[PDB]
Coordinates of C-alpha atoms and ligand atoms in Angstrom, one line a residue:
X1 CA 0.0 0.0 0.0
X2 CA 0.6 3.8 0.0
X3 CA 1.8 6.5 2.5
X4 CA -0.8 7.8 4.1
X5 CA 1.1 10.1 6.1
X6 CA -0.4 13.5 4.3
X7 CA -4.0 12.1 5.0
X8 CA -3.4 11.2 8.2
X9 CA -1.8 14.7 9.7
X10 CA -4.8 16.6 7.4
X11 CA -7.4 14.6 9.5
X12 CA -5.3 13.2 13.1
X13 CA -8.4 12.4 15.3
X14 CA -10.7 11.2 12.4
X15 CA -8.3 9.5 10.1
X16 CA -8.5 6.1 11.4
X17 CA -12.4 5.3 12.2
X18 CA -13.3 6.9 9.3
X19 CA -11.3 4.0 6.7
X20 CA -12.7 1.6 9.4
X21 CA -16.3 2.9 8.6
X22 CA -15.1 2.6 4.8
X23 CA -13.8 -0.6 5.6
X24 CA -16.5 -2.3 7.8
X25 CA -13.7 -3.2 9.8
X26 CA -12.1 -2.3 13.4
X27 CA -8.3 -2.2 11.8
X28 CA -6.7 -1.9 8.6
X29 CA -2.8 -2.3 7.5
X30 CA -1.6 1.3 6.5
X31 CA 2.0 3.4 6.6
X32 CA 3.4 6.2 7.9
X33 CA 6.9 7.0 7.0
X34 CA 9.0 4.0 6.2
X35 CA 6.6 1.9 8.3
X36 CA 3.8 -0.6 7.7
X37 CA 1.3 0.5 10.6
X38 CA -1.3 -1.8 11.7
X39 CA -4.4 0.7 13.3
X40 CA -6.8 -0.4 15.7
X41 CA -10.3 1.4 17.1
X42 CA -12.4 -0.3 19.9
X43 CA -12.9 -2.0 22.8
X44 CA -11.3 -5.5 22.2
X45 CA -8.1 -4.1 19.7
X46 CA -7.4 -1.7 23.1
X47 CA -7.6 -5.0 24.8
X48 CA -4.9 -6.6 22.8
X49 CA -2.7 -3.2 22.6
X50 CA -3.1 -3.4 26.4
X51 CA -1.4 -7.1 26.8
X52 CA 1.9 -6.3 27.4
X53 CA 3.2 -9.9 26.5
X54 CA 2.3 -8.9 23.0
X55 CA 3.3 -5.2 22.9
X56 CA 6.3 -3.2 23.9
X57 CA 7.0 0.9 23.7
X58 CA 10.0 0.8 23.8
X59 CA 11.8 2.5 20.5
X60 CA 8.0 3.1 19.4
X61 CA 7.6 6.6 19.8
X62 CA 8.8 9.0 17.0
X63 CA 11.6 10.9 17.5
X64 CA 9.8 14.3 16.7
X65 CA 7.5 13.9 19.8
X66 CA 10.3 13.0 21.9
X67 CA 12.2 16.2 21.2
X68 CA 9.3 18.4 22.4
X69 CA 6.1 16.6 23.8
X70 CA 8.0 13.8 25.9
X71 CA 11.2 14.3 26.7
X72 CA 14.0 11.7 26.3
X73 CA 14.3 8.8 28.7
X74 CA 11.1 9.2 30.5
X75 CA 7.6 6.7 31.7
X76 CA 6.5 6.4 28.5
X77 CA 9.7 4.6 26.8
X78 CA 9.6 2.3 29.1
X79 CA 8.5 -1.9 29.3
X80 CA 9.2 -5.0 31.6
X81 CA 9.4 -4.4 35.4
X82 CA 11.5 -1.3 34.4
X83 CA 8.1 0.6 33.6
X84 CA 6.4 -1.0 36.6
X85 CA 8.7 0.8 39.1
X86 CA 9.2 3.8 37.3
X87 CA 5.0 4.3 37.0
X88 CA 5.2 3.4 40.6
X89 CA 6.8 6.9 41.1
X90 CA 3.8 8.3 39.4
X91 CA 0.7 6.4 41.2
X92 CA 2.2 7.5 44.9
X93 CA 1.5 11.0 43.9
X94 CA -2.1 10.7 43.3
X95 CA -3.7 10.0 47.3
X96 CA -7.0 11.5 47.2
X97 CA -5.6 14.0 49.8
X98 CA -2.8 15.0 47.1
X99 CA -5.3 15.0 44.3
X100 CA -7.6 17.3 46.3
X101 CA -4.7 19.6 47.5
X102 CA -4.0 20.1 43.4
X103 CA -7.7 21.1 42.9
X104 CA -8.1 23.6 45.6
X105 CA -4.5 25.3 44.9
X106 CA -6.5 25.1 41.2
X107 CA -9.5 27.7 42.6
X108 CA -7.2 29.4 44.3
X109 CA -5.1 30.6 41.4
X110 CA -8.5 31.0 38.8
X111 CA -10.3 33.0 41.3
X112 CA -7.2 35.1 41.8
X113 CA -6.7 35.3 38.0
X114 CA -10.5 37.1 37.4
X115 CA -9.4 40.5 38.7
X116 CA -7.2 40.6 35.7
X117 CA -9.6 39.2 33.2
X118 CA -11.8 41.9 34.4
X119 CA -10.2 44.6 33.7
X120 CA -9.2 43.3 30.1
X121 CA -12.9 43.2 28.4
X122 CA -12.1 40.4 27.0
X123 CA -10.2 37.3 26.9
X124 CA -9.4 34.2 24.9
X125 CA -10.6 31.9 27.6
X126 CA -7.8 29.4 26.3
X127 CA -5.0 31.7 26.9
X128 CA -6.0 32.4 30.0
X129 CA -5.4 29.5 31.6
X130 CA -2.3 28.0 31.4
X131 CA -0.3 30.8 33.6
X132 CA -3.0 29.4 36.7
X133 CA -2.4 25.9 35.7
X134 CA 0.9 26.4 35.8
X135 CA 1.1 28.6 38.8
X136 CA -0.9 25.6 40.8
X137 CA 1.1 22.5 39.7
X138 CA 4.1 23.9 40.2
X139 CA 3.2 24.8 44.0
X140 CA 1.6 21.8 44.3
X141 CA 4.8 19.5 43.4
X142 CA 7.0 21.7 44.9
X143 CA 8.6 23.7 42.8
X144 CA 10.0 27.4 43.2
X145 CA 8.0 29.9 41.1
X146 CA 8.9 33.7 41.0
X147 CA 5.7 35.7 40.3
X148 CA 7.4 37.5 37.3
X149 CA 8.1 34.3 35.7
X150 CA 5.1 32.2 35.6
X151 CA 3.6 33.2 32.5
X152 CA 7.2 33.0 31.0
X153 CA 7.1 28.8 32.4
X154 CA 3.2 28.6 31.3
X155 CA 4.3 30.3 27.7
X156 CA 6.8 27.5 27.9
X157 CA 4.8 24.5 28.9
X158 CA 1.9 25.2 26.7
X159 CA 4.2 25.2 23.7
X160 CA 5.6 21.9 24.4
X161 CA 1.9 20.8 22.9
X162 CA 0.1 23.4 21.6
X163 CA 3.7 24.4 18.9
X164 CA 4.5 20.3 19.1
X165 CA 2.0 19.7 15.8
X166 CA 3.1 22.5 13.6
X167 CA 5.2 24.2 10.8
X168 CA 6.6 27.2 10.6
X169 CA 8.2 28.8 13.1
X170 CA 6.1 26.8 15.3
X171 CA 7.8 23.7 15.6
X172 CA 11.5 25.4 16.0
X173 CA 9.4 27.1 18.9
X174 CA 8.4 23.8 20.9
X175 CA 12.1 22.5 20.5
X176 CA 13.5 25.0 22.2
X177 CA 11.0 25.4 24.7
X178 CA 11.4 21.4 25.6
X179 CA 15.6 22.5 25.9
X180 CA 14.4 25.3 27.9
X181 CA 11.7 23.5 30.0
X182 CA 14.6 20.4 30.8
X183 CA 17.3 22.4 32.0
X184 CA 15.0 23.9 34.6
X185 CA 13.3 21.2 35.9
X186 CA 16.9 20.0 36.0
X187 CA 18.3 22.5 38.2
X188 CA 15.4 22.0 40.0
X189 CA 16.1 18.6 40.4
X190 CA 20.1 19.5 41.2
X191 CA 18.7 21.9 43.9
X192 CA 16.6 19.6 45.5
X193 CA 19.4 17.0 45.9
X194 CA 22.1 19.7 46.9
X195 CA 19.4 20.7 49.8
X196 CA 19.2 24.5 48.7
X197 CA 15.2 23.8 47.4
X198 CA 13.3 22.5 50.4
X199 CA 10.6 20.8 48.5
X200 CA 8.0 18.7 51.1
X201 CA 8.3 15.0 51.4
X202 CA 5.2 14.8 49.9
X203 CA 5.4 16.5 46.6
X204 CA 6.4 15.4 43.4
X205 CA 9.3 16.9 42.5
X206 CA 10.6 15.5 46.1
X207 CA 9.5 12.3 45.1
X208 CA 11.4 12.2 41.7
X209 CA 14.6 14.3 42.9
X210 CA 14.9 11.2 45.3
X211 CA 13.5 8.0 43.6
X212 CA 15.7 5.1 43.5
X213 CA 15.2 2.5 40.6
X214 CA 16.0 -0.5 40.5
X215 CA 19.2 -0.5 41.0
X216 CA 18.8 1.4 44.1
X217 CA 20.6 4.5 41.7
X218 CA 19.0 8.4 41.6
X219 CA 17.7 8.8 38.5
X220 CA 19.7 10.9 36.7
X221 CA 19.1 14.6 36.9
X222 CA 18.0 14.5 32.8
X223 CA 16.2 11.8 33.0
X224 CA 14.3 13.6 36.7
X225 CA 14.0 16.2 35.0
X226 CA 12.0 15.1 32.3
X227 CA 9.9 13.1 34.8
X228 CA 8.9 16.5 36.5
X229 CA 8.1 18.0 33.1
X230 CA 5.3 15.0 32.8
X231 CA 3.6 15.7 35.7
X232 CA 3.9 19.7 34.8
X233 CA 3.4 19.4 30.9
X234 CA 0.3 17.6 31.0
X235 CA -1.9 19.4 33.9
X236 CA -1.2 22.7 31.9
X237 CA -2.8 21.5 29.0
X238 CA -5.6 20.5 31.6
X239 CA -6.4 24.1 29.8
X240 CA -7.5 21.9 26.5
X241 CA -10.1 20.3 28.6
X242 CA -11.5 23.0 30.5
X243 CA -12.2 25.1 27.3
X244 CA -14.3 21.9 25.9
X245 CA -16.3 22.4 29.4
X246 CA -17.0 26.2 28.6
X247 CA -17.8 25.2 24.7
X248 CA -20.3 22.0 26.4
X249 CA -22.1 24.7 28.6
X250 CA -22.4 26.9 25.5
X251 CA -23.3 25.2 22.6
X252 CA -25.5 22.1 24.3
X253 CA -28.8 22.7 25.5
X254 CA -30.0 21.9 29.1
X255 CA -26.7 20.8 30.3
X256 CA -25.9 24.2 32.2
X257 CA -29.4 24.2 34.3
X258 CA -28.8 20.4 34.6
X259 CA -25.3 21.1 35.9
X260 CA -27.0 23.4 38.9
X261 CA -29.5 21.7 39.9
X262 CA -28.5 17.6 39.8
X263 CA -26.3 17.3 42.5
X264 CA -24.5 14.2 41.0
X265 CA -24.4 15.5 37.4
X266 CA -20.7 16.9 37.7
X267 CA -19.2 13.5 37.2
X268 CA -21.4 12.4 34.3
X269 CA -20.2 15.6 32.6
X270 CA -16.8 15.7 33.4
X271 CA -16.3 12.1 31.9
X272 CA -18.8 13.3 29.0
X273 CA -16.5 15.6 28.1
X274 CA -13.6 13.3 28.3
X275 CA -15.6 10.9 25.8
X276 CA -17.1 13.4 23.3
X277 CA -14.1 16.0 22.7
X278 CA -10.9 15.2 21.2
X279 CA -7.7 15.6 23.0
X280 CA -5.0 12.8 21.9
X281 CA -5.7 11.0 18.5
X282 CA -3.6 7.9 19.4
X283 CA -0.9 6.1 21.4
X284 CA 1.3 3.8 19.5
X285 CA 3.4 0.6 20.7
X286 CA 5.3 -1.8 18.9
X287 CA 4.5 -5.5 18.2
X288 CA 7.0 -7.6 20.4
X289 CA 6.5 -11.0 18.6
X290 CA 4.4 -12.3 15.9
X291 CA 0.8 -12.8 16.2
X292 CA -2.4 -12.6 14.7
X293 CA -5.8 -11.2 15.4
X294 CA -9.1 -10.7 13.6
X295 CA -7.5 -12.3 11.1
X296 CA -4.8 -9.5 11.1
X297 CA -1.3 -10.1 10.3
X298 CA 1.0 -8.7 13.9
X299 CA 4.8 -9.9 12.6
X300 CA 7.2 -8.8 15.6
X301 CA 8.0 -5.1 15.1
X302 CA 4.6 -3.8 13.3
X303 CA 4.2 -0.4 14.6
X304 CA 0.4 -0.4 15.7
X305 CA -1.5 2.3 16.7
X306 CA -4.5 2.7 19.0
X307 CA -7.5 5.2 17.9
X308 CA -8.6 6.7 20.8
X309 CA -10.9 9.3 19.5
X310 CA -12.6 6.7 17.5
X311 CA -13.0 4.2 20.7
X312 CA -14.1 6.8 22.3
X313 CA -16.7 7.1 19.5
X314 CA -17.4 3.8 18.6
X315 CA -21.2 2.6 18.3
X316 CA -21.0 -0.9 19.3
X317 CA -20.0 0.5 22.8
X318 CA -22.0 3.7 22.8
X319 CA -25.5 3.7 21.0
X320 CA -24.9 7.1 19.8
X321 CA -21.6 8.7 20.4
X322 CA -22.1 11.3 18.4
X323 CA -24.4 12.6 20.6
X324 CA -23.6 14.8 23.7
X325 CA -24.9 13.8 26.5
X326 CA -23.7 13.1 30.4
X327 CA -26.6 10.5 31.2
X328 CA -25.1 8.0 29.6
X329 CA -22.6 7.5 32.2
X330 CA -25.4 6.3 34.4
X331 CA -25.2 2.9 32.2
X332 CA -21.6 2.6 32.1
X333 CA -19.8 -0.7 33.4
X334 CA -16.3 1.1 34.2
X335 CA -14.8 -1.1 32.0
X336 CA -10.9 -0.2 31.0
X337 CA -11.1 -1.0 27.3
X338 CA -14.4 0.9 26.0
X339 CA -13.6 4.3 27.2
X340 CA -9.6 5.6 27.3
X341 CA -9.3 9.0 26.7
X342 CA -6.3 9.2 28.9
X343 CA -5.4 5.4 27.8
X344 CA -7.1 2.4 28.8
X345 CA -5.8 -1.0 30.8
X346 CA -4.1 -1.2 33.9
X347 CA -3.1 1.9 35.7
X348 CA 0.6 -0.3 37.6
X349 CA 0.8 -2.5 35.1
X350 CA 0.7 -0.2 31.6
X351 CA 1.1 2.6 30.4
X352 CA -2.6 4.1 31.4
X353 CA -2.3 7.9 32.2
X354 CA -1.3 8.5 36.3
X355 CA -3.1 12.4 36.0
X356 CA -6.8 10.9 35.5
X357 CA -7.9 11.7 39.1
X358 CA -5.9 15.5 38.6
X359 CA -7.7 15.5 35.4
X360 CA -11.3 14.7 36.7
X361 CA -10.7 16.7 39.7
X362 CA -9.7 20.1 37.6
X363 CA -12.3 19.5 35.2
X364 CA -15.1 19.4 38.5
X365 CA -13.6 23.1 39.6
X366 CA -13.9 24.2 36.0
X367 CA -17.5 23.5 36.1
X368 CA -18.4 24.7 39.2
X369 CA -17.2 27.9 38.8
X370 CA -18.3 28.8 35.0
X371 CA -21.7 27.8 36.6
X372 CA -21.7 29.0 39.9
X373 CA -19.2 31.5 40.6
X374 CA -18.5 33.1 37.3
X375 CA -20.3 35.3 34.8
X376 CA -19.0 36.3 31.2
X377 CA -20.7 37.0 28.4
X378 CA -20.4 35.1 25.1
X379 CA -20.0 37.3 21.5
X380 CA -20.9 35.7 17.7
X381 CA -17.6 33.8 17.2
X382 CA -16.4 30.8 15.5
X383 CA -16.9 27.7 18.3
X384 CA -16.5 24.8 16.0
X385 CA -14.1 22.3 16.6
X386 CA -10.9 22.7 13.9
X387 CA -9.9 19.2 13.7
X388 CA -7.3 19.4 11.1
X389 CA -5.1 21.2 14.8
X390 CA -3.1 19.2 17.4
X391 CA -4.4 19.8 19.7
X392 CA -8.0 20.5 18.1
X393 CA -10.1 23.4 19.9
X394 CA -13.5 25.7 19.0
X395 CA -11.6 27.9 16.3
X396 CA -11.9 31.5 18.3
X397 CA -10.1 29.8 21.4
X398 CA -13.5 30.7 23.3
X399 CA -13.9 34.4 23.9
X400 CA -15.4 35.4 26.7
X401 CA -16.4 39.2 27.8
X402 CA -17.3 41.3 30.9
X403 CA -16.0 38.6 33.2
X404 CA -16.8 39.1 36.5
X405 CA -16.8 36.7 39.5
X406 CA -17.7 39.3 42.3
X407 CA -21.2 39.8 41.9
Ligands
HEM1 C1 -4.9 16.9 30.4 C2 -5.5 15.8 29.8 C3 -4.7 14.6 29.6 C4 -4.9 13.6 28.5 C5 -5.8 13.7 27.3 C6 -3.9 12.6 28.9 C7 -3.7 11.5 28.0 C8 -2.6 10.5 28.3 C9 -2.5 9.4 27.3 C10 -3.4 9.0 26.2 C11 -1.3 8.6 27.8 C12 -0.7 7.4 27.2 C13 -1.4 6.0 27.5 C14 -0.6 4.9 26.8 O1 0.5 5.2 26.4 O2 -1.2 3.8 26.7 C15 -0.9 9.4 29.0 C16 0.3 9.0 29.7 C17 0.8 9.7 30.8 N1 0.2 10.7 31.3 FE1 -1.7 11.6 30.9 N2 -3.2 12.8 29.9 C18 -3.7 14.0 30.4 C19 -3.2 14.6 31.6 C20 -2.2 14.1 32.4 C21 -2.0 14.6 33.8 C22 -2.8 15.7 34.5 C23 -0.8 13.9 34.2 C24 -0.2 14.2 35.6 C25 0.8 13.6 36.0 C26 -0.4 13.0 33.1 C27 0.8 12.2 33.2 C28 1.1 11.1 32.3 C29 2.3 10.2 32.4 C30 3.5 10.4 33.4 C31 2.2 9.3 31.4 C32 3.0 8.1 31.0 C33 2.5 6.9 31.8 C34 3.1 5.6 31.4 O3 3.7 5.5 30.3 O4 2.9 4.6 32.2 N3 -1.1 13.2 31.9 N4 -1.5 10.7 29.2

């Protein structure tokens, strides 16, 4: 067959399910580069990509995402019982205490961000919140953060993803950014262990500054330092997320009144949101001996590549995915195949995102207030989705004006 890699980066999310709909099948043999790439959409082909006795990540990844979105050397190269105690490291962070402590620091920095929205008119409601994200997280996992550089460091961390899917001088952008972004999480790191930063026991960039592996060896400070970037990177772009909640509360009818009222209705959304809006098209492994499945062809070293946007919208799991709507959560079996936004699986034993509690619990203060704390008004603007964008997102960004939270 072909290349396929123009179609593919002209449609990310959509790509794949829409040759399986083409197809009548839930995976087809395709390439991208040099490779032969087997994709996969739904519940049982996330099962498979899940088994780790049949799938490694190691070498897997890209080199183009490693040299902005990742890092080098971190969680998500990883296999074996080398991955295992490494994601370790990650699931001690996220106590219900911890994850709670995140979320308040969270409302702390929005509500003290609203003064200055105030007296701009108006804001692109995306823009807006990375520097809170950022100023949160890094407090949170204990890391020093000089109020005249925080929207420098949120600048930097939102670039790692929203300039890492780009061209122009967009993608020289997010390089530089990830060399800028690693050298100071890594004299972070150095500080910590020299005992000049006096990070708390309990917060992560403690936690990584001093994790042994298993070797009973530090890290080194590299390789910490682009641990501390994952737990930073990703709860900035928390940001993605929380604009999808404003564009949800806008554009679908009944869900804000149902939001203040129903008590238990937060959850159903939040996870609504996590179903119905893209965020990540795909994850991608690497087949670690041959197989096959569905009467699919898996030699040892097939790149493969998990849909998750198309899961996520598949029919045989969700009667009608295309349609928004929270209830449906009501039904669901928490099964860790049919719904994997953030990955699906085993949280220890995979590679299943650590930040889904951090994401859930951000994504609950994000409602709350846009429903019961904060006013705005919303102009005539562009909120489609543009899904041709990594990472996609309503066109205008969201603009919001007269934002007020005092009244
Ligand atoms: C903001 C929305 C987020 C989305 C859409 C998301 C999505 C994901 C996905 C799809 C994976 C890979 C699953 C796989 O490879 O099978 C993942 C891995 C990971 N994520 Fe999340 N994530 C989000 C936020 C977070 C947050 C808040 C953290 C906080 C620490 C986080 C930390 C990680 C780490 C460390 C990995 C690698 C885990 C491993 O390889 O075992 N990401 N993310």
């Amino acid at each position: 067959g072909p290349d396929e890699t123009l179609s593919l980066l002209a449609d990310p999310y959509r790509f794949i399910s829409r040759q399986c709909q083409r197809l009548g099948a839930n995976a087809f043999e395709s390439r991208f580069l040099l490779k032969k790439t087997n994709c996969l959409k739904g519940a049982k082909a996330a099962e498979i990509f899940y088994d780790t006795t049949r799938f490694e990540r190691e070498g897997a990844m890209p080199v183009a995402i490693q040299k902005t979105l990742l890092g080098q050397g971190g969680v998500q190269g990883l296999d074996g019982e080398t991955h295992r105690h490494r994601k370790q490291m990650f699931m001690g962070l996220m106590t219900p205490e911890r994850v709670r402590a995140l979320a308040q620091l969270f409302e702390a920095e929005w509500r003290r961000a609203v003064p200055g929205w105030t007296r701009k008119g108006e804001i692109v409601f995306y823009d807006e919140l990375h520097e809170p994200l950022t100023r949160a997280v890094c407090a949170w996992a204990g890391v020093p953060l000089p109020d005249d550089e925080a929207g420098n460091r949120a600048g930097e961390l939102r670039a790692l993803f929203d300039a890492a899917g780009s061209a122009s001088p967009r993608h020289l952008w997010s390089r530089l950014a990830r060399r800028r972004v690693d050298a100071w999480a890594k004299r972070i790191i150095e500080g910590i262990r020299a005992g000049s930063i006096g990070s708390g026991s309990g917060t992560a960039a403690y936690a990584i500054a001093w994790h042994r592996d298993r070797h009973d060896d530090l890290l080194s400070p590299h390789v910490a330092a682009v641990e501390l970037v994952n737990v930073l990177r990703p709860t900035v772009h928390i940001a993605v997320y929380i604009t999808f909640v404003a564009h949800a509360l806008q554009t679908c009818s009944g869900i804000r009144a149902a939001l203040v009222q129903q008590p238990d209705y937060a959850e159903l959304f939040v996870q609504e949101v996590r179903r119905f809006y893209p965020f990540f098209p795909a994850v991608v492994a690497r087949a670690s001996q041959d197989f096959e499945w569905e009467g699919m062809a898996f030699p040892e070293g097939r790149q493969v590549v998990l849909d998750l946007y198309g899961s996520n919208h598949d029919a045989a799991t969700w009667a009608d995915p295309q349609e928004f709507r929270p209830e449906r959560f009501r039904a669901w079996d928490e099964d860790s195949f049919n719904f994997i936004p953030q990955g699906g699986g085993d949280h220890y034993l995979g590679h299943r995102c650590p930040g889904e509690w951090i994401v859930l619990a951000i994504m609950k203060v994000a409602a709350h207030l846009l429903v019961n704390a904060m006013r705005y008004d919303v102009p005539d603007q562009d909120l489609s989705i543009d899904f041709a964008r990594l990472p996609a997102l309503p066109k205008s960004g969201f603009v919001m004006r007269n934002v007020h939270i005092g009244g």
